[PDB]
Amino acid sequence: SGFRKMAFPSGKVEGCMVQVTCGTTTLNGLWLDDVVYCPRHVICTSEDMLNPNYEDLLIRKSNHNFLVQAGNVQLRVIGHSMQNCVLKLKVDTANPKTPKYKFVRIQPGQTFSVLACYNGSPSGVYQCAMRPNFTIKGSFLNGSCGSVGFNIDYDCVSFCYMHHMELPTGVHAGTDLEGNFYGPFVDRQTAQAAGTDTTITVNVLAWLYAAVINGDRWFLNRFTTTLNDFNLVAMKYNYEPLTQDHVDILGPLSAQTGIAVLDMCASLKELLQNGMNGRTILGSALLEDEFTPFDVVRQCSGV
Amino acid sequence: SGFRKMAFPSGKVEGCMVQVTCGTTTLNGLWLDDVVYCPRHVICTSEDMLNPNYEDLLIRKSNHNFLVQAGNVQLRVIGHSMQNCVLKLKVDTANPKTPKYKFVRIQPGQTFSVLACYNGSPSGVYQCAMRPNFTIKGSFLNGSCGSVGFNIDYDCVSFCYMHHMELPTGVHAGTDLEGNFYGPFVDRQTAQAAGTDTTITVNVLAWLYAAVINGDRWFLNRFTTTLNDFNLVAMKYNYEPLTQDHVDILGPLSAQTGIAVLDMCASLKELLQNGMNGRTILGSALLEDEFTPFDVVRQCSGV
Ligand SMILES: COc1ccc(/C=C/C(=O)N[C@H](C(=O)N[C@@H](CC(C)C)C(=O)N[C@H](C=O)C[C@@H]2CCCNC2=O)C(C)C)cc1
Numbered sequence: 001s002g003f004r005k006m007a008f009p010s011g012k013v014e015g016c017m018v019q020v021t022c023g024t025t026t027l028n029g030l031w032l033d034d035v036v037y038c039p040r041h042v043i044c045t046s047e048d049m050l051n052p053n054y055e056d057l058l059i060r061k062s063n064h065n066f067l068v069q070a071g072n073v074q075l076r077v078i079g080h081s082m083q084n085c086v087l088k089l090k091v092d093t094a095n096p097k098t099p100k101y102k103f104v105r106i107q108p109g110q111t112f113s114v115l116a117c118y119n120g121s122p123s124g125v126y127q128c129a130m131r132p133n134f135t136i137k138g139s140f141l142n143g144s145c146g147s148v149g150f151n152i153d154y155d156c157v158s159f160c161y162m163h164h165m166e167l168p169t170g171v172h173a174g175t176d177l178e179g180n181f182y183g184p185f186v187d188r189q190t191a192q193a194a195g196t197d198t199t200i201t202v203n204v205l206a207w208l209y210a211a212v213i214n215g216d217r218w219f220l221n222r223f224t225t226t227l228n229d230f231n232l233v234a235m236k237y238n239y240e241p242l243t244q245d246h247v248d249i250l251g252p253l254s255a256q257t258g259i260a261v262l263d264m265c266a267s268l269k270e271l272l273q274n275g276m277n278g279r280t281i282l283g284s285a286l287l288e289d290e291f292t293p294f295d296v297v298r299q300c301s302g303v
Numbered sequence: 304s305g306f307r308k309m310a311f312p313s314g315k316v317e318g319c320m321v322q323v324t325c326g327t328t329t330l331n332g333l334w335l336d337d338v339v340y341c342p343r344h345v346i347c348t349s350e351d352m353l354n355p356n357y358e359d360l361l362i363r364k365s366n367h368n369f370l371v372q373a374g375n376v377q378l379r380v381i382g383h384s385m386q387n388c389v390l391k392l393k394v395d396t397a398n399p400k401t402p403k404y405k406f407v408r409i410q411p412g413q414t415f416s417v418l419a420c421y422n423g424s425p426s427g428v429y430q431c432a433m434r435p436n437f438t439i440k441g442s443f444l445n446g447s448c449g450s451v452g453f454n455i456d457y458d459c460v461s462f463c464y465m466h467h468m469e470l471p472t473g474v475h476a477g478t479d480l481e482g483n484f485y486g487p488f489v490d491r492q493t494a495q496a497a498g499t500d501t502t503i504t505v506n507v508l509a510w511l512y513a514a515v516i517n518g519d520r521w522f523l524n525r526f527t528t529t530l531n532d533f534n535l536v537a538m539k540y541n542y543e544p545l546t547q548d549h550v551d552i553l554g555p556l557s558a559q560t561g562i563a564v565l566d567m568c569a570s571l572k573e574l575l576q577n578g579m580n581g582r583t584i585l586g587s588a589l590l591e592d593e594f595t596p597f598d599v600v601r602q603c604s605g606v
Pocket residue numbers: 027041044049140141142143144145146164165166167168172186187188189190191192193304
């Protein structure tokens with residue numbers, strides 16, 4: 001019993017992290033086979049950051065301009081290319097710690113673990129969600145760029161995020177590992193702001209199911225609702241609409257607890273309209289939306 | 304910027320986890336050098352759990368009665384001994400992945416990371432505190448025993464917790480790696496309950512400092528307080544007393560923000576007496592007490 005914000009074990013990703021230095025900018029790289037992937041603004045100075053000309057900056061760089069260290073072992077770069085917002089540094093040694101891996105572009109509302117790194121060395125691991133406005137609420141300082149987000153599917157690490165920038169909201173934006181940004185953002189210091197965020201409704205419902213599984217059931221009421229009636233209330237409280245696909249995804253949790261999805265939706269409607277009146281659910285005074293249904297199943301069933 | 308409940312990277316501990324099976328009970332073991340450490344109730348059946356005679360159960364076990372697997376590699380046990388509540392299984396191979404390590408007994412109010420495992424394989428990692436009543440609020444299912452808690456100090460893993468039991472509160476109890484329980488608990492199915500928990504005051508104050516560092520400052524008021532006046536209010540709200548040692552530990556955060564500790568204490572006193580009136584601090588509607596001052600410094604300074 002018990003329910004915690006739980007990250008994937010990070011050892012497979014830890015063996016992939018290296019330090020990339022170009023001139024005076026230093027950030028992290030991801031060393032897979034004989035390629036190092038890292039954010040392309042590693043080739044920038046700060047005068048190259050309000051309107052950087054990346055292609056111009058790159059043509060003036062030769063292979064030796066990139067200092068890549070893995071521990072106290074320097075790796076020699078023997079090739080470089082730019083793909084979208086990411087640099088690919090070909091190195092003369094293949095990483096012996098390379099795990100089985102995939103590059104994935106995740107959808108809004110999905111969660112992943114972040115291994116935060118500085119100078120190529122791990123700092124900590126935590127769990128994030130891709131917000132509906134294509135930001136993430138992370139924890140990143142200067143020098144954390146090149147940190148990656150991932151999921152572990154049995155043996156395979158599915159890399160889905162590489163860190164690039166902070167919006168002055170304290171929220172964070174980045175790319176998939178092909179260098180395509182999540183959301184409308186660009187890798188320049190200009191006036192970009194994220195759209196308004198919304199609450200991930202299917203995730204809140206998964207979390208209420210985790211609550212019931214853990215014995216915190218006070219919020220269950222005697223009522224039911226229709227999907228359309230529920231969505232009309234949710235919308236007023238800035239919740240995303242719940243689709244029938246979402247209902248289907250909650251099937252396993254519904255069957256484990258014997259609570260129909262539309263019955264749990266009636267309980268959530270009452271929580272939205274009435275508040276919690278001082279009470280907590282799973283130790284939280286707010287409704288939580290960064291646990292997917294698969295997250296809940298995995299935690300409440302032992303991987 | 305940003306602040307998240309962050310766990311230590313778990314790769315060093317992952318290479319140490321194995322599966323220990325004795326008869327029909329299976330749990331996790333910690334393989335360090337040529338010794339496997341695991342909870343001694345691995346030798347129990349359930350009829351041996353209301354009043355187990357561990358020494359009696361153990362004398363009837365021979366080395367071959369312990370099946371230890373590390374991946375799809377079986378390790379041969381060549382010796383066994385019981386130390387307090389933990390079994391030590393001598394094995395004929397030293398773990399090549401053994402990191403530099405220490406066995407530590409932590410104090411109430413300190414935090415650590417838990418690598419939750421089942422059948423010797425990692426499930427997830429999360430951050431816990433040793434509560435003042437010597438429990439932890441974890442996430443453990445059947446088969447998670449032998450999971451360990453740890454801190455990473457630069458290169459050294461300081462193992463401080465091994466998981467043994469769940470109290471029907473949904474809270475968890477265990478031993479240090481010498482097999483001595485934290486708190487008054489014993490490894491039997493009887494009627495044990497933990498003492499009343501209290502809020503870890505120095506940790507709440509560290510978290511308010513993290514809030515200020517991150518730009519969430521609405522709760523700062525114009526006042527100061529004495530240490531004695533503060534402790535009189537805190538006590539009524541089931542907060543532990545703040546000592547001068549605690550004040551000293553907050554020195555670095557106080558100097559970074561320019562807020563005296565006693566000034567931050569006046570702000571916390573007002574939060575305790577008045578509530579938050581709907582507002583959140585760092586996204587929480589409750590005051591958080593599972594970040595130590597070192598936690599906050601480490602996260603807000605990049606390891
Ligand atoms: C007026 O409304 C505004 C709206 C948006 C912005 C800035 C977006 C921006 O420029 N973010 C910068 C950034 O992330 N730059 C990237 C690099 C550029 C080329 C995209 C970066 O520094 N990346 C860091 C290097 O690793 C990590 C950052 C910085 C440290 C703070 N936290 C982090 O994640 C911040 C430093 C302000 C400013 C004003």
